[PDB]
Ligand binder design. Structure first.
Ligand code: ATP
Ligand code: ATP
Ligand code: MG
Ligand code: ZN
Ligand code: ZN
Ligand code: ZN
Lengths: 216, 66, 432, 660
C-alpha cells in the first residue's frame, strides 16, 4: 500500500522563529526562514517486521516513535519470550528522511542579535526541496523531541551519552528534567523543540517537438 | 548546416582577410568565429540552411572591429 | 601426549644421528654453543628434508605447534651432552632457500604458513619483558603454584586449585623468569612496488637471541610465520596480520650497537691483507668506481678518499677534531654528476641519498613528535641521523631553500645536533 | 520442470522467494548455462568460451559478463538480476565454475570459486539521487576515491564452540557487514559461552573505501556527498587514492545505534558492496565502448595486430593516424607518436640505470592547435595527467606529506607525476609558471624517481613518466632572425632534458591558407551533429572515420598498449661510426654557431627513437631503416631551430648523413 501524505498550505497568518512557544506544540503552523544546512536523504524505519527466535512467528506493522522498538508479547502460541527478535529488513517499510537547519531573516533580526536557529524535519516527497542560502516558507506541526540516549537504546554504542565537548555549566541542573518513569530508571528525561514540515515553498532542451507541446 | 556555395564563400573571405592583414592578428580562430556568427545569424531568422548573405554579414561584423 | 613424545623422540634422534662424512655437525654445534653461553641452535632445512621427509612435512603444516617440541628436544639433548641445572629452553633458528614472496603478495592464502621475504627496516622499538615461568598464589587459601609459558601464540586460571572468588590469583614477581621481546617495522623494496602505488609497511616480532640485530635503513631477509592477532576499524571480524621472526640475514655486518669489533673470519682477513699488499691497489680501487663512466679520474680518486676517511683525534683539553671529508661538485649539465651520487650510495655500507628540492631542516637533522597514546614529545631521527658513520648524498644542492640549508652548518663540522624544543634540550651525535 | 515462458508468472508476492524456490532455481541454472555456452555475436564466434579459455591461462579468478548480451536474449533473467542481485549471483557463480570445468578439468586445485563481474549496466545514478527505493538492488555509481583502509583478512565460514555441552556449530556465512549472532544451542538447549573455534578456518581479503562525488558532476557551489564501499577478495588494491572510478554494486542498509542516538529518529546506515570497478581517470572515450577495460585485447585482436604489423609502411599509417582532423604539422605528429610508443629502459650489471622515455617540447605561435594535440594525447594514452601554468604547485606535481586522520602519523600522498607512472604528464603553458614549481621536475625528468626527506620520512619513490610540454615564445611570437636562447626564458639544464623540440611558425602563404581553410570548413561540416538501429549508428560513425583515419582509434589504442606491454627490442647489429660522426658533428656545429645545448644526453635519444620506431613495427630487433629515420628526425629537429642566415649552410652540411 502507498503510505499517503497530506499537504496543507495557504494558512492565514505566518509566524517567525521567535514566536515559537511550547503552548503551540501539536498545532498546525507555518513558518519562514533562510536555509543554512541540509543533510543526506537517509531511510527511516516506518513499519517494522520481526521474527521470534524460537517459534519463527512473524510480527508486522510495529510502530516506532523515536527509537528502535521491538515487540513484547509473542504472537499466537504458548511460547513465552520478551526479547531476542530479528528484524526482517526486507519486509519492513522505509521512508525518506532529511534534516535542515534554518535561521531568522535579515529583517526580523534586531539591530544587535545572534540569530536564532531551529531544526526542521522533511519527510517523504519533500526531500531536497530546500537548498542552502534560499529563503523558504515551511508549514507543518510543531513537535517536541526527547533525548533517546538516556531512554535505554539497545546497543552499547551510545555508551551513556559519550561526549567530545563540555556541556554548559550554566544550565547544569537548570534544565528541568523529569524523573520517575521505569524505563528511565533514576535518569532524567529532557526535551527540545523542533519542527516537522509537510509542505515547502520558496519566497526568496533543444528539441523542437517537446518544446511545441508545453506552449498553449 | 552549411551549403555548397557557403563553404566556397567562407574560404574566399578568409583568404581575403588574411591577405588584408599582412600573420599578426588573423588566425584560424577568426574563421571559426565567422562560422559561429553565421550560424547565430541563421538562428535569428529561424532557417535551417545558411546563405552566403549571412557569411557576408558576419564578415562585415568582423571587419567593423578590426 | 602420545604423539608429542614420539615427535620429541624423532627430533632427538635427528639431532644425535645426523652425520655427513665423518662428523656429527649438529651434535658439535650444540657443545660449541654451550661453552660460550649461547643457548640456541641453527638448523638448515635441506638437511632435515634429506634425513626424513615426514618430519619436514609435520613442521611445514603446523609450525606454532611443532616448533616448541623441537625446542624441548634441543634442551633435552643439551643436558645429556653437557651435564653428568641453569639451562633455559633453547632457541631454534631456521635457514631456508625457498622462493621469496613479495610483501604485497601476502594474503589470506598464507596464514599459519612459514614464508620467506625481504624488505627494508625503517624502525626498531625498545625491548620489553615477557614471562616464561610464573609463580602464582591465591588471595584466600594462599598456596604456591607455577605456570610455564612458551611465546608461540594464555592467562591465569579462572578458578581455584587446592570460598575463594571468581579467579583469585596474583603473580609473585620475585622468583619469576622473563625474556626479551622486540618489535620491528618492514617496508617493500623500492623497485618492487607496483605502478602508481605507495610503499606499504608490516610488523614483525623478534625474541631472545634475535633482538638488537638490525638497524634502520638496512636491507634484510626474513624467515618467519605469517599470523594474525585479534585486537582493537569498523569492519566486522577483521584481524591484523604480523610476522614472527625465526631467522634474519643482514647485509651489513654491524649489530645494533656496532661493537667496533672484527666480524671477519681468518679466511677473509688473509684475503684482505693479501689485497692490501698489492703495489697497484690505488689504481684498482679507482678503476672500480663507476666502471660505466668515462674519464673523471680525479673525482673518482676523491670519492675513494671520502669512502676511506681520515683519522679522528681527542685532546686533553676536550677538543674534538673532525676526521671526515666533504666534497662538492659544481658543474655543467650532462657531465655524470648525478650518476656518481647513486653509485656512492650503493657502494657505501651506510649511505642515504636525498634531494635538496624535497627536503626540510626538520627532515634533515631531527624532528619532534607527539605520541597519540602517551601524549608527550619525543625526538625522531632524520637524514643526518640515519646516515651516521656513513655518507649523505644531497642532490640539487643549489635548489635548497636558504632556511633549510643553514641547518647543516653545525653537523658538518662540530658533528652534533642541538635540540632545545618543547622541554627537550639534548645534543645528539652525527658523524657523517 | 518449468520453461522460459513459465518464469514470467510470479508467486509468493516477492521476487526473492520466487527465485529461491527449488524448482525455479533448477531452470534458472540451466538457462544461464545455455546462455554461457551457446551465445554468439554477429561474426559467429562464442565469446564466453574464449573468455573461459583465457581465464585458465591467466590464472584468473573472475569472469566478465556483459549485461547487454544477457538482456538481448533471456531478458527475464536480466530483469531478475537487475532487481535481485544477491540470490542470482550465487547461482551464476556456480554455473560459471561448472562451465569453466569443461575446458580446464581439475581447475579446483588452483581456485575453488569463480566470481562474476557484471558490466555495462544500463542505468547510471549519482550519489545525490540515491533513495530508499534502490535498497537491495544493483546500482551503478560514479565517484572519486578519497581514502582506503587497507587489506585485512576476514572470516568466511564462522564457527562456534560451547563448553558445557561441548557443541560445535555448523559453518555460518558472514554478512561482511553484520556480526554473526548466535545464542541458541541445538544440543545445549540453553545459553552457553561461545568460542571462535581457533584455527581451521577460511579467510577472505577485505578492504573499505570512501567515494565522494566528482567535481564535474556536483552542481557549481554545492557541497559534495560521500558513501562507503566494501571491496572483497580479487577486488582489493584495484582502486587508488586520488583516482576517479565507476562502481557497480548492491545498495544495502544496516542498523546503527549512534546514528539513532544523535539524530533522534530510527534512521539506518547505508553502504555499497562493490561488484565491478571501472577506471575513468583521464578517459573521455567513455561516451562509447563496452567493457571494464578498453585497453585490453582478445585473441583475435592480437592476431589482427600481428597481421597488420607486417605490412610495409605501418609507421607512415601510424603517424598519419595521429590527430587526423589537424592539418599538417607532420613533425609534431611524428614526435607525438615516438613519445607515445616510447623506448626501452636499461640496467647494466645492476649498478647503472638508463632511462627509456622520450620527452617532447612544442614552442610555437598562437593559434596553431598545440593544446588540441595535447588533448588528443591525453585521450589516447593509457595513463594521463593534465596540468596548466599557475594551477600546479611544487608538491602538486610531486609527493606531499599529510597527517593521517586515523593513524595520526605523517604519511606520503601522491601527485601528478606519481599518478602518471608509466604514463604521460602534460603541462600546457609551460613558460607561464613559477621557477620553484618548474624546478621540481628536474629529478623526475631524468632519474625517474622522487626523493623526500620531511618530518621523519626519508623515502624514494618512482615516477617513470614522459612529459610533453607546450610553451609560447618571448613576445608571444617567434623571431626567426634570432637564436633559440633569446626566444625563450628556460636555461640549459631544463632544455637538455628534452629529446624533441618542435618550433611552430605561422607564415603568410595564400595557397597554404586556402588549403587549411578548406580542411577546417570540411571538418566543421563533418562534425555537425545533425537490422538494429544501434548498429546502424556504429556503421555511420565508422563511415566518418573512414575518410581521415587509415586505422580506427579503438584498434590503435589496443595496438599501442600491446606494443608497450609486450615488445622489448634490442640493438645487436648497428652502425656505430655513423652515430659517432653525427654526434661529433652536432657537437662541433653548436659552440661555433648555435644556441641549442648538445651533450652526451642527446646521443642516447637517437637510440631511444630507433627503439621506438622498432616498437611501432612489433619487431624484436632494431634495423638500419629505424636508426636512419631516428638520425633524420634528430637532424631535422636541430637544423630548423637556427637563424635564417646559417640555416641554409647547416642543412647542406648535414645532408650527407640522410641520403635516403
Ligand atoms: N662521461 C660519461 N660517461 C657515461 N655516461 C655519461 C657520461 N656523462 C654523462 N653520461 C650520461 O648522461 C646521462 C645524464 O647524466 P646525469 O643524469 O648524471 O647528469 P647530471 O650531471 O646530473 O646533470 P644535471 O646537471 O642536468 O643534473 C646519463 O645517462 C649518463 O649515463
Ligand atoms: N591545422 C590547424 N592549425 C591550427 N589550428 C587549427 C587547425 N585545425 C583546427 N584548428 C583549430 O584552431 C583553434 C586554435 O587551436 P588552439 O586553441 O589549440 O591554439 P593554441 O594557440 O595552440 O592554444 P593554447 O594557447 O591553448 O595552447 C582550435 O579551435 C583548433 O581546433
Ligand atoms: Mg643531476
Ligand atoms: Zn515465540
Ligand atoms: Zn583459593
Ligand atoms: Zn551449549
Amino acid at each position: 500500500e502507498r503510505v499517503f501524505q497530506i499537504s496543507f498550505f495557504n494558512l492565514p497568518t505566518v509566524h517567525r522563529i521567535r514566536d515559537i512557544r511550547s503552548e503551540k506544540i501539536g498545532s498546525l503552523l507555518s513558518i519562514s526562514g533562510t536555509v543554512t544546512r541540509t543533510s543526506e536523504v537517509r531511510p527511516e524505519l516506518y513499519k517494522a517486521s520481526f521474527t521470534c527466535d524460537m517459534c519463527r512467528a512473524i510480527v508486522d506493522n510495529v510502530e516506532q516513535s523515536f527509537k528502535y522498538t521491538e515487540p513484547t508479547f509473542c504472537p499466537n502460541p504458548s511460547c513465552e519470550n520478551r526479547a531476542f527478535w530479528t528484524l526482517n529488513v526486507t519486509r519492513s517499510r522505509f521512508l525518506d528522511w532529511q534534516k535542515v537547519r534554518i535561521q531568522e531573516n535579515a529583517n526580523e533580526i534586531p539591530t544587535g542579535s545572534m540569530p536564532r536557529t531551529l531544526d526542521v524535519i522533511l519527510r517523504g516527497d519533500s526531500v531536497e526541496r530546500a537548498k542552502p542560502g534560499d529563503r523558504c516558507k515551511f508549514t507543518g506541526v510543531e513537535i517536541v523531541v526527547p533525548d533517546v540516549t538516556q531512554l535505554g537504546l539497545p546497543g552499547v554504542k551510545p555508551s551513556s551519552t559519550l561526549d567530545t565537548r563540555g556541556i554548559s555549566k550554566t544550565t547544569e541542573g537548570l534544565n528541568s528534567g523529569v524523573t520517575g518513569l521505569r524505563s528511565l530508571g533514576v535518569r532524567d528525561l529532557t526535551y527540545k523543540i523542533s519542527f516537522l514540515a509537510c509542505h515547502v515553498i520558496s519566497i526568496g532542451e533543444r528539441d523542437q517537438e517537446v518544446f511545441l507541446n508545453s506552449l498553449s | 548546416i552549411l551549403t555548397k556555395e557557403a563553404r566556397s564563400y567562407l574560404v574566399e573571405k578568409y583568404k581575403e582577410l588574411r591577405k588584408d592583414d599582412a600573420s599578426y592578428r588573423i588566425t584560424v580562430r577568426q574563421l571559426e568565429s565567422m562560422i559561429r556568427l553565421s550560424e547565430a545569424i541563421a538562428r535569428a531568422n529561424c532557417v535551417d540552411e545558411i546563405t552566403p548573405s549571412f557569411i557576408a554579414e558576419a564578415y562585415d561584423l568582423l571587419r567593423q572591429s578590426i | 601426549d602420545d604423539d608429542n613424545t614420539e615427535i620429541i623422540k624423532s627430533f632427538k634422534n635427528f639431532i644425535l644421528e645426523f652425520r655427513l662424512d665423518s662428523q656429527f655437525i649438529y651434535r658439535d654445534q650444540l657443545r660449541n654453543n654451550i661453552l660460550v653461553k649461547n643457548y640456541s641452535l641453527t638448523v638448515n632445512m635441506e638437511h632435515l628434508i634429506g634425513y626424513n621427509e615426514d618430519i619436514y612435512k609435520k613442521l611445514s603444516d603446523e609450525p606454532s605447534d611443532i616448533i616448541p617440541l623441537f625446542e624441548t628436544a634441543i634442551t633435552q639433548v643439551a643436558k645429556r651432552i653437557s651435564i653428568l641445572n641453569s639451562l633455559p629452553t633453547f632457541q631454534l633458528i631456521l635457514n631456508s632457500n625457498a622462493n621469496q614472496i613479495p610483501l604485497r603478495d601476502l594474503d589470506s592464502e598464507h596464514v599459519s604458513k612459514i614464508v620467506r621475504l625481504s624488505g627494508i627496516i625503517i624502525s626498531t622499538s625498545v625491548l620489553s619483558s615477557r614471562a616464561t615461568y610464573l609463580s602464582i598464589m591465591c588471595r584466600n587459601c594462599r598456596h604456591t603454584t607455577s605456570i610455564t609459558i612458551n611465546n608461540f601464540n594464555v592467562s591465569l586460571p579462572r578458578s581455584c586449585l587446592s570460598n575463594c572468588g571468581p579467579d583469585p590469583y596474583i603473580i609473585i614477581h620475585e622468583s619469576s623468569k622473563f625474556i626479551d621481546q622486540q618489535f620491528l617495522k618492514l617496508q617493500e623494496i623500492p623497485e618492487l612496488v607496483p605502478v602508481g602505488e605507495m610503499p606499504r609497511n608490516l610488523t614483525m616480532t623478534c625474541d631472545r637471541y634475535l633482538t638488537n640485530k638490525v638497524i634502520p635503513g638496512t636491507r634484510v631477509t626474513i624467515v618467519g610465520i605469517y599470523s594474525i592477532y585479534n585486537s582493537k576499524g569498523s569492519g566486522v571480524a577483521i584481524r591484523t596480520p604480523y610476522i614472527k621472526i625465526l631467522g634474519i640475514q643482514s647485509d651489513v655486518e654491524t649489530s645494533s650497537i656496532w661493537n667496533s669489533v672484527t666480524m671477519f673470519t681468518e679466511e677473509e682477513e688473509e684475503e684482505f691483507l693479501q689485497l692490501s699488499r698489492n703495489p697497484k691497489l690505488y689504481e684498482i680501487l679507482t678503476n672500480s668506481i663507476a666502471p660505466s663512466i668515462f674519464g673523471n679520474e680525479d673525482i673518482k680518486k676523491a670519492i675513494v678518499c671520502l669512502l676511506m676517511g681520515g683519522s679522528k683525534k681527542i685532546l686533553p683539553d676536550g677538543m674534538r677534531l673532525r676526521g671526515d671529508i666533504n666534497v662538492l661538485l659544481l658543474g655543467d649539465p650532462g657531465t655524470a654528476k648525478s650518476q656518481l651520487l647513486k653509485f656512492v650510495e650503493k657502494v657505501s655500507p651506510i649511505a642515504v641519498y636525498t634531494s635538496g628540492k624535497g627536503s626540510s631542516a626538520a627532515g634533515l637533522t631531527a624532528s619532534v613528535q607527539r605520541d597519540p597514546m602517551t601524549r608527550e614529545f619525543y625526538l625522531e631521527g632524520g637524514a643526518m641521523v640515519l646516515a651516521d658513520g656513513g655518507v649523505v648524498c644531497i642532490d640539487e644542492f643549489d635548489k635548497m631553500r636558504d632556511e633549510d640549508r643553514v641547518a647543516i652548518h653545525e653537523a658538518m663540522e662540530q658533528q652534533t645536533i642541538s635540540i632545545a624544543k618543547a622541554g627537550i634540550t639534548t645534543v645528539l651525535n652525527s658523524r657523517t | 520442470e518449468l520453461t522460459l515462458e513459465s518464469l514470467s508468472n510470479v508467486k509468493a508476492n516477492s521476487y526473492s522467494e520466487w527465485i529461491t524456490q527449488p524448482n525455479v532455481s533448477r531452470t534458472i541454472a540451466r538457462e544461464l548455462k545455455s546462455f554461457l555456452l551457446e551465445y554468439t555475436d554477429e561474426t559467429g564466434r562464442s565469446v564466453y568460451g574464449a573468455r573461459i579459455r583465457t581465464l585458465g591461462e591467466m590464472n584468473s579468478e573472475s569472469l566478465e559478463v556483459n549485461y547487454r548480451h544477457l538482456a538481448e536474449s533471456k531478458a527475464i533473467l536480466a530483469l531478475f538480476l537487475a532487481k535481485c542481485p544477491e540470490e542470482m549471483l550465487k547461482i551464476f557463480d556456480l554455473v560459471a565454475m561448472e562451465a569453466t570445468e569443461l575446458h580446464y578439468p581439475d581447475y579446483a586445485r588452483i581456485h575453488s570459486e569463480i566470481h562474476v563481474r557484471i558490466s555495462d549496466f544500463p542505468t547510471i545514478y549519482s550519489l545525490r539521487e540515491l533513495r530508499e527505493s534502490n535498497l537491495s538492488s544493483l546500482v551503478r555509481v560514479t565517484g572519486v576515491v578519497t581514502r582506503r583502509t587497507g587489506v585485512f583478512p576476514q572470516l568466511k565460514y564462522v564457527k562456534f564452540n560451547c563448553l558445557k555441552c561441548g557443541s560445535i556449530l555448523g559453518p555460518f556465512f558472514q554478512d561482511s557487514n553484520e556480526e554473526i549472532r548466535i545464542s541458541f544451542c541445538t544440543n545445549c538447549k540453553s545459553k552457553g559461552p561461545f568460542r571462535v573455534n581457533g584455527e581451521k578456518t577460511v579467510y577472505r581479503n577485505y578492504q573499505r573505501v570512501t567515494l565522494q562525488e566528482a567535481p564535474g558532476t556536483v552542481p557549481p557551489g554545492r557541497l559534495p556527498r560521500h558513501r562507503e564501499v566494501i571491496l572483497l577478495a580479487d577486488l582489493v588494491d584495484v582502486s587508488k587514492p586520488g583516482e576517479e572510478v565507476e562502481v557497480t554494486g548492491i545498495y544495502k542498509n544496516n542498523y546503527d545505534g549512534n546514528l539513532n542516538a544523535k539524530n533522534g529518529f530510527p534512521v539506518f546506515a547505508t553502504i555499497i558492496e562493490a561488484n565491478s570497478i571501472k577506471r575513468r581517470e583521464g578517459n573521455t572515450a567513455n561516451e562509447g565502448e563496452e567493457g571494464l577495460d578498453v585497453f585490453s585485447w582478445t585473441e583475435e585482436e592480437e592476431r589482427e595486430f600481428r597481421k597488420i604489423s607486417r605490412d610495409r609502411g605501418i609507421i607512415d599509417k601510424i603517424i598519419s593516424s595521429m590527430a587526423p582532423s589537424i592539418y599538417g604539422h607532420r613533425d609534431i605528429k611524428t614526435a607525438v607518436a615516438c613519445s607515445l610508443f616510447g623506448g626501452v629502459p636499461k640496467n647494466v650489471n645492476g649498478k647503472h640505470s638508463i632511462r627509456g622515455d622520450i620527452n617532447v617540447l612544442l614552442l610555437g605561435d598562437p593559434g596553431t592547435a598545440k593544446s588540441q594535440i595535447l588533448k588528443y594525447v591525453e585521450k589516447t594514452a593509457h595513463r594521463a595527467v593534465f596540468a596548466t601554468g599557475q594551477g600546479a604547485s611544487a608538491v602538486g606535481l610531486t609527493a606531499s606529506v599529510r597527517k593521517d586522520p586515523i593513524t595520526k602519523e605523517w604519511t606520503l600522498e601522491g601527485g601528478a607525476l606519481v599518478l602518471a607512472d608509466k604514463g604521460v604528464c602534460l603541462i600546457d603553458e609551460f613558460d607561464k609558471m613559477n621557477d620553484q614549481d618548474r624546478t621540481s621536475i628536474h629529478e623526475a625528468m631524468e632519474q625517474q624517481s622522487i626523493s623526500i626527506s620531511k618530518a621523519g620520512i626519508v623515502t624514494t619513490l618512482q615516477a617513470r613518466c614522459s612529459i610533453i610540454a607546450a610553451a609560447n615564445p618571448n613576445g608571444g611570437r617567434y623571431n626567426s632572425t634570432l637564436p633559440l636562447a633569446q626566444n625563450v626564458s628556460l636555461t640549459e639544464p631544463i632544455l637538455s632534458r628534452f629529446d624533441i623540440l618542435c618550433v611552430v611558425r605561422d607564415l603568410v602563404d595564400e595557397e597554404a591558407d586556402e588549403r587549411l581553410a578548406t580542411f577546417v570548413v570540411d571538418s566543421h561540416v563533418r562534425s555537425h551533429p545533425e537490422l538494429n538501429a544501434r548498429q546502424r549508428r556504429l556503421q555511420r560513425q565508422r563511415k566518418k572515420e573512414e575518410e581521415i583515419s587509415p586505422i580506427p582509434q579503438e584498434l590503435l589504442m589496443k595496438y599501442i598498449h600491446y606494443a608497450r606491454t609486450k615488445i622489448y627490442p634490442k640493438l645487436h647489429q648497428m652502425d656505430m661510426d655513423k652515430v659517432s660522426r653525427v654526434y661529433a658533428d652536432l657537437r662541433r656545429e653548436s659552440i661555433s654557431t648555435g644556441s641549442f645545448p648538445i651533450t652526451v644526453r642527446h646521443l642516447e635519444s637517437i637510440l631511444r627513437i630507433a627503439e621506438s620506431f622498432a616498437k611501432m613495427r612489433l619487431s624484436e630487433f632494431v634495423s638500419s631503416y629505424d636508426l636512419d629515420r631516428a638520425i633524420k628526425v634528430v637532424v631535422d629537429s636541430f637544423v630548423d631551430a637556427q637563424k635564417v642566415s646559417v640555416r641554409r649552410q647547416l642543412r647542406r652540411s648535414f645532408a650527407i648523413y640522410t641520403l635516403g
